Amino acid sequence: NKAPIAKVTGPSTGAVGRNIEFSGKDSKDEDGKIVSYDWDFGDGATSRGKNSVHAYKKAGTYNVTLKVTDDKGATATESFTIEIKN
Ligand SMILES: [Ca+2]
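That is the input. Now the predicted structure with calcium ion docked in place:
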């Protein structure tokens, strides 16, 4: 098996209190299927889904982590920086 490769699409800037839409659908497993897309939004919040949403309560800079898992259980991550403005 080869582990998958995580790819996040979504905004790199958003605004406080607004729902930010993220996707992991461009992630790729060369030899199988991605079976889960886990998100850590950098403010303690987590979600799961090929698409996910999060609103940040405070302006600042956050690193979002996407963790993809393939059909064999191998994992990969991406760290993606988002700026949240007032
Ligand atoms: Ca694989």
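The radius of gyration is 13 Å.
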